[PDB]
Amino acid sequence: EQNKTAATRYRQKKRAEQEALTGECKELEKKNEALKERADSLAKEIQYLKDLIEEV
Amino acid sequence: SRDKAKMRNLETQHKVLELTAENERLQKKVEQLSRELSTLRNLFKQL
Ligand SMILES: [Fe+3]
Ligand SMILES: [Fe+3]
Ligand SMILES: [Fe+3]
After folding, report:
1. What are the φ/ψ torsions at residue A2 (nearest 5 degrees)?
2. Distance A51 CA to ligand 1 centre (A)
3. Quick check: A53 and B46 in contact, CB under 8 A?
4. Of A31, A8, A27, which is closest to residue A19 (Cα–Cα)?
5. Among the listed residues A22, A26, A31, A30, the one whose alpha carbon sits nearest the alpha carbon of residue B12
6. Measured between alpha carbons, how far is B30 from A17 in angstroms, rounded to an integer?
7. What is the sign, positive or negative, of the torsion defined by CA atoms of A30, A36, A40, A45?
8. How many domains does chain A have?
9. What CATH number has the domain bearing residue A51?
10. Residues 6 or more apart in contact with residue A38 via CB below 8 angstroms
11. Chain B window 2-31: which residues touch A at a Cβ cutoff of 8 Å?
12. Contact: B41, A24; criterion CB under 8 Å
């Protein structure tokens, strides 16, 4: 029919849209975790050097 | 069913906005910690 197609195309479009949004969200979520790592790591490095200095 | 998907959609948009906020926060902190660390290293790089 011609009404079933219009319904399908709709869904296929509507589906690809959620996927893009979920995907955007997930990638943004992975980028954020990476940043939290750099942050912690840098902080550990900083504390290490500070300690080195205080130890003198 | 349409509504469920609509809420599912509203929630993900809300989430992207939060992460985009936190992401911006983290960049500044990382940039901040990088400068601090850079100075500490420059201290030891004397000898
Ligand atoms: Fe270390
Ligand atoms: Fe919400
Ligand atoms: Fe300096």
Report:
1. -110, -10
2. 11
3. no
4. A27
5. A22
6. 33
7. positive
8. 1
9. 1.20.5.170
10. B30
11. 5, 8-9, 12-13, 15-16, 19-20, 22-23, 26-27, 29-30
12. no
Domain containing residue A22: 1-56
Resolution in A: 2.6
Q: Does A49 touch chain B (CB under 8 A)?
A: yes
- Tokens 């790592």 identify what position? A37
Closest residue in chain B to residue A38, using alpha carbons only: B30
CA atoms of B32 and A25, how far apart (whole Å): 26
Domain ranges of chain B: 1-47
- CB within 8 Å of B9: residues ≥ 6 apart: A18, A21
Q: Which fold has domain B1-47?
A: 1.20.5
